[PDB]
């Protein structure tokens, strides 16, 4: 046991999932813009 190594590595992963979600929600914000523009 060396606590930090595995108890921090498990965090790094979460922030890669997190980063996916962010990069995702923008695509929705992209289609929302586009949804307005093309009709307007």
């Amino acid at each position: 046991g060396l606590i930090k190594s595995l108890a921090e590595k498990e965090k790094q992963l979460l922030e890669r999932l997190e980063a996916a979600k962010k990069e995702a929600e923008e695509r929705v914000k992209r289609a929302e813009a586009e949804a307005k523009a093309l009709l307007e």
């Binding site: 046991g1 060396l2 606590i3 190594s5 595995l6 108890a7 590595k9 498990e10």
Partner: protein, 632 residues
């Protein structure tokens, strides 16, 4: 199946977690825990896994159940794959088939039991009843009574009915079957007469009883006749079923067992990172390396020879780090000779211990429960017999030496080399054990003592080492003071042992010897200062047990002087075969007790071992009854 890697699980004492971890870590293992206090970096518990668990339990249980009703039960074995679903499917037809027959068997037995019992009253009652059981138009009450009740029912009947009834009885064994017959109009009164009498309507459960006697009687005859034949046929099917399919069950069953544990283990790692052991999940490549580097310790679930064998198991606790003190591994040569030399005897005894041994590592098939012991058959399981092959030999070795100490003993039991009486008594050799000379006895007494004095040393050195190497001043002080104690014992003893050998060589040194004692006991201060009496009792205990080892020994020997030598008749050459009548019975009782005597050693050792003299067990504690360890 549990992860894409397959788990290997190992456990042992608290000390091994770290060593187990280092060898495993190196092997190429992945998803490793124990490790740190909040690890969850692999895989965790989920509904599905639990569901699967439930399913495995069903599989396990069903096999067990079917085997139980069927008869015999399965061994453990190594897993044989077959899909979980497949397994579930497999289990189904067989349990069902077996179960149906199980029911049938019970039913047949039940039919017979009632049918035999009831058959005799029913034919007898029917015969009496006959002519009313074509269609009751007269109403009838059957009942059985033996001799005593018989006036009581009649008197009751007479008052109520008058004499308009027919009362009949005949004996047939099982009392006498009695009938009351009345008109269908008198029925109410007739029964009322019975209520007083205390006898009442004989009944058969179900349809048959209500149906008059003749119909019922016929029905009992067909069932009685039918059931034994039917039972045979089904039972035979069951026997067949066992022979072939028991095998199927066993392999499935076993597979289920390993799976259940494996999953459970997994649940334990997931959540809260396990306790003390060490697990991990192993790719097939890692799997040989893990078996390879082990330092003699762990217990896993995957998915000269006498001297070496127990020595190899004490070694795992030799490698355990938990103190700088020593373990009880040296124990084996102090125990082993002596244990054998516990056996003492001659022609009628020790020199016959050979036979006993020959049945252990062997057997003789004249022995009702030592049938084929090489393949193990006993009044306890065959498996136990197979396992304790290791033991059967260690006992056999005991027998080989015990016979030998029969001649060791028998050196001082005969000759014209040293005792001025005959070379071997001509009736039977050995007739009078010659040791009753003060001196002859004394040397054997003091001899026994000596192996014990050394044992006192063995403990207190180790003991002092616990406190030395941990810096427990308390353990150091204990060990040291007790060696001070030894000095005073030796002073007094000499003054009686030669009487005048010392006792003023060391009996005036004695004034200063008491000083050698008390130096470090007072340094611990101690509140249980008195306990030093009992510590003197330990020096003496080694002597005392050893003394008993002599005396009880001798006692054993004195029975051949009446039990094989001579005790009946003035003296003849027929005395040989006159004496065996009592001798032989008494022999086994005698035999038994010396088995008890060999436990005196272990206790002797245990005085030191289980009581911390540089040792783990202290009135129990972790570390396990060592007796049971060295035995193999």
């Amino acid at each position: 199946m549990i992860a894409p890697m397959e788990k290997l699980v190992l456990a042992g004492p608290k000390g091994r977690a770290k060593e187990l971890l280092q060898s495993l870590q190196q092997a190429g293992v992945v998803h490793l825990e124990t490790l740190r206090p909040e690890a969850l970096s692999a895989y965790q518990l989920s509904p599905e896994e639990r569901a699967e668990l439930r399913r495995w339990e069903a599989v396990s249980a069903g096999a067990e159940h079917t085997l139980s009703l069927l008869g015999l039960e399965a061994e453990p074995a190594r897993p044989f794959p077959e899909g979980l679903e497949a397994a579930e499917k497999a289990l189904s037809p067989i349990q069902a088939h077996a179960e149906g027959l199980t029911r049938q068997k019970q039913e047949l037995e039940e039919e017979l039991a009632l049918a035999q019992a009831y058959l005799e009253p029913l034919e007898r009652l029917a015969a009496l009843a006959h002519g009313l059981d074509k269609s009751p138009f007269l109403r009838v009450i059957p009942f059985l009574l033996t001799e005593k009740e018989l006036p009581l029912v009649e008197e009751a009947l007479r008052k109520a009915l008058e004499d308009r009834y027919l009362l009949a009885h005949e004996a047939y064994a099982g009392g006498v079957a009695a009938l009351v017959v009345v008109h269908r109009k008198e029925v109410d009164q007739a029964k009322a007469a019975l209520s007083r009498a205390g006898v009442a309507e004989l009944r058969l459960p179900g349809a048959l009883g209500e149906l008059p006697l003749s119909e019922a009687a016929r029905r009992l005859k067909e069932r009685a006749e039918a059931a034994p034949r039917e039972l045979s046929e089904v039972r035979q099917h069951l026997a067949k079923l066992a022979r072939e399919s028991a095998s199927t069950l066993q392999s499935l069953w076993t597979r289920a067992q390993d799976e259940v544990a494996r999953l459970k283990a997994l649940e334990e790692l997931a959540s809260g990172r396990f306790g003390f052991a060490l697990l991990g999940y192993v790719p097939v490549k890692a799997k040989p390396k893990v078996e390879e580097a082990l330092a003699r310790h762990k217990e896993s679930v995957v998915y000269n020879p006498p001297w070496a064998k127990p020595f190899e198991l004490l070694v795992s606790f030799l490698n355990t780090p938990k103190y700088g003190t020593f373990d009880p591994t040296p124990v084996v040569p102090v125990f082993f000779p002596f244990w054998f030399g516990m056996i003492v005897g001659d022609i009628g005894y020790a020199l016959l211990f050979y036979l006993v041994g020959r049945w252990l590592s062997g057997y003789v098939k004249r022995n009702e429960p030592l049938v084929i012991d090489l393949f193990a058959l006993k009044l306890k399981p065959q498996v136990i017999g197979k396992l304790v092959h290791i033991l059967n030999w260690m006992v056999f070795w005991t027998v080989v030496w015990g016979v030998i100490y029969g001649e060791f003993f028998g050196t001082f039991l005969e000759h014209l080399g040293v005792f001025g009486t005959p070379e071997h008594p001509g009736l039977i050799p050995i007739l009078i054990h010659r040791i009753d000379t003060a001196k002859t006895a004394n040397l054997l007494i003091l001899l026994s003592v000596a192996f014990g004095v050394v044992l006192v040393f063995f403990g207190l050195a180790l003991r002092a080492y616990l406190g030395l190497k941990h810096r427990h001043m308390a353990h150091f002080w204990e060990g040291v003071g007790y060696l001070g104690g030894l000095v005073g014992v030796l002073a007094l003893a000499a003054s009686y042992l030669g009487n005048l050998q010392a006792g003023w060589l060391q009996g005036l040194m004695y004034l200063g010897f008491g000083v050698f004692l008390l130096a470090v006991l007072m340094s611990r201060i101690w509140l249980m200062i008195p306990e030093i009496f009992t510590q003197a009792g330990h020096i003496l205990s080694h002597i005392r047990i050893y003394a008993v080892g002599a005396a009880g020994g001798i006692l054993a020997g004195l029975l051949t002087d009446v039990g094989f030598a001579l005790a009946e008749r003035l003296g003849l050459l027929g005395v040989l075969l006159g004496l065996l009548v009592a001798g032989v019975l008494h022999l086994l009782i005698l035999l038994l007790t010396t088995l008890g005597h060999m436990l005196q050693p272990i206790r002797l050792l245990w005085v030191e071992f289980f009581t911390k003299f540089g040792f783990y067990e202290e009135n129990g504690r972790p570390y396990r009854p060592f007796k049971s360890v060295r035995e193999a």
